[PDB]
């Protein structure tokens, strides 16, 4: 009994519908990947990430794929926390930071 006012694409669960609707209210678009955000501050937080495709927070190195990025991060030390530069929330791995950041800062640890 759920449907999106923006494109009428009926939903059965309201959580998924909740996630859908958010994608229509996203004017702030990047240029380094064209990913989208709801507020200018969120977009700016996102590009803080770009030392330039994919970048290491610790040493600013870039890699052609996320696999080599992932493997590279294994070489680093205590960290540990990846901190979102938009909401300051911290994360255990970069995959969980990115996923948080790209959904407009959604999802709280643990």
């Amino acid at each position: 009994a759920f449907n999106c006012k923006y494109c009428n694409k009926e939903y059965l669960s309201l959580g998924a519908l909740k996630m859908h609707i958010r994608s229509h209210t996203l004017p702030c678009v990047c240029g380094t990947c064209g990913k989208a955000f709801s507020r200018p501050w969120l977009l700016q937080g996102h590009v803080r990430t770009h030392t330039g495709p994919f970048s290491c927070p610790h040493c600013s190195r870039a890699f052609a794929d996320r696999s080599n990025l992932r493997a590279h991060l294994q070489t680093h030390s205590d960290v540990k926390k990846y901190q979102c530069q938009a909401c300051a929330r911290t994360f255990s791995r970069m995959s969980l930071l990115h996923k948080h950041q790209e959904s407009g800062c959604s999802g709280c640890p643990r």
């Binding site: 669960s13 501050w41 996320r66 080599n68 294994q74 540990k80 255990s92 995959s95 709280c108």
Partner: protein, 859 residues
Amino acid sequence: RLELEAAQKFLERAAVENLPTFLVELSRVLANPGNSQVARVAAGLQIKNSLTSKDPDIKAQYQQRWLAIDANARREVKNYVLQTLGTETYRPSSASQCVAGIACAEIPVNQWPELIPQLVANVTNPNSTEHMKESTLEAIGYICQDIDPEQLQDKSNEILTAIIQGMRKEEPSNNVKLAATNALLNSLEFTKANFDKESERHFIMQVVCEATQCPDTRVRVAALQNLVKIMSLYYQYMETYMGPALFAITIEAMKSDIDEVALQGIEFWSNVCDEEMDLAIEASEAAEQGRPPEHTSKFYAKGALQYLVPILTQTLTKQDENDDDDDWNPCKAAGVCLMLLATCCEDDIVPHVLPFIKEHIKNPDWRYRDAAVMAFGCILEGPEPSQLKPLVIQAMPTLIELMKDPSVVVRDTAAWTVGRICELLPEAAINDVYLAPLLQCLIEGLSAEPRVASNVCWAFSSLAEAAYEAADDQEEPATYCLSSSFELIVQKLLETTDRPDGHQNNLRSSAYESLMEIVKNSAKDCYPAVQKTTLVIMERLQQVLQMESHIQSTSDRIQFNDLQSLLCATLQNVLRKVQHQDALQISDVVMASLLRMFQSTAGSGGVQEDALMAVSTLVEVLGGEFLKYMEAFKPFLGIGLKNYAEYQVCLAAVGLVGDLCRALQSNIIPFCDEVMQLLLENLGNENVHRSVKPQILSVFGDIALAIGGEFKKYLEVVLNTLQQASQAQVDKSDYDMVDYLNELRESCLEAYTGIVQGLKGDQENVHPDVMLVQPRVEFILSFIDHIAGDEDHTDGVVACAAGLIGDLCTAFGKDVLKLVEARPMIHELLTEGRRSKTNKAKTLATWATKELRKLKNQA
């Protein structure tokens, strides 16, 4: 400190007066095993500090300074540095860092070809002692770490053998093995050709797996770390080793009573989840909707799910009723791994974790009770929400009582799970069966420990959006399920805001986010309370700025800017939906908050663009009587235009000037002089991003359209500026510059248009002022002529080119037509616009055609 100056600058009046002489004498007191271990390291530390740095640019600049020293001096440096390996019997050694320091400068220019074959020799030589092979492997490690693997590709197989020989089980010294195993971690990048051949690969994996069996735990952890790296680098080659070797190793590692070993075993499978989720996307996207993958998944995580899960959930018991955060132990690692498994394995995760939950949710031992509600919350994302909804129903009122558990950590876990349910699956919440009792539970939760209350704030935010989108989300609904609780939730959130421990666990900020979230996500019958609440939020965020801005940390600043940015959007939300008269009522207070957000906040930020956007919204709602705020806004508008660094702010400000033009019209005249100077300056400043210039050219037209003949002061400089911009040329084989050319052309044409229209007036006939632009008509039409024959022009350009042709006909008459038919390419352009799918280009090209026809008939 008293002997520090006589050192920490006494060794700097040398490094700048004569760095060659310095580096040579230091290397001597490094190479001699007679001087103190302190002076020796200090020397090595001095040499290392001379070659490298954490800052990539001064490293790049310290290296060129090294490649400038007399080659005989450097060879002396490299002789003593290298001859130190094995001599030092303390610490990891200081020479090994000097080797890599020098090497990272000299190797990429083929300046030390001797080094690598010599370093390989040190480890390989059977005569070599412990300390020789150890220090050498470390240096090899440092080199492979700090250098580009593309610069070592021809020596790669020499590096590898030295490392393997150090890792072999035969080697008596574990210190060497550790040094070698750490070296391998930094050198898995250029063994690619090795791993590709099966028999070659087999030997490497054998050594690494063998090293995970070393009774020294350092070698264990290091080798386990290698396995995590190998899985990311060579995922497509692990089918061979997962079964017979990798499963048993990591599985047994997760079960270790040594936390460092457990964390690596868990990280192995968390990492597999990251690879196999990234493949699940590659197989899902582009693939099928293009040809199919292209890197297939072997589903290692799905396949081990039945022996991973029971180990993980047991590890969720191994906790501290304290810990603090970020604490990283196997317990907290296990939970994150379970989560990743759920988003990777989806539905398959459910029947493995569920018997644990239903068996421990009531256990008297709190660590087992905590683990159960935690495991429950971990699986809420990934599996179908279908299978998921009737399952939280079992646990919901149990979750509600667990909120009042005697153990502080169960209480905390329960709240996170609730918040996670409210965000992912609020069906259990937004339900006539559990909504009211859950709200009571949440209201009580705001009064709980900060760790619990913050999770409740989160849950409230998720509930408010879920409730808002659920019937009956423009246009706004008359009522929603939080209506009879709205004013109560707000006052409870505001109470939380004033808590003495609001600084803990981001409580205060989380509550402010909840407040703004329910204000935005509210029904029409909540508006009187929404209006008051909005006012309260502004007064207190003002207090936070005035009272705490100077004491905020870097992280407080990111949060406060996030909240101010949220406040802007909240203010835009409210001002667009409430009755116009109510928007007028609060617009004075709204303006004050926005004006406080400019460049004062922040050092690390800021939110100027968000604030300018909110002003634009207030400008669009008020329109003409925004005039009262124009005097107070002026400096902050000026700040936005002078912010060429943050060009996004500049764009918003320029765009705002245009909005003020349509709102204030001729009332903007007192403010035009300064704005025009700022805009003109921005154009004559090559340190400005190119994207702002067309927007500035456009706003020239908006300004001219508003002040009419008052624009005569700027006509000469503006028209000439437009002439240079219209004559711009770019490389046609540069799609980015061609797109920018079109954006510049479209704004040039817009500018001309507004100047012609603005000088013309709205009445008939034309005001004499427009005749001042007449000498430009031939160039303008010549400009449109060149655009016509370019072929790479857009339909947005054709539209504006058409709109200008129509406007010139009305202003100047017969002369325009003589000029147009002398350039037949123009009619080609208007036809292209007439036969267009772009609605704006078809109306204007038709209008321009019509006007041209009248001119001919009127001849």
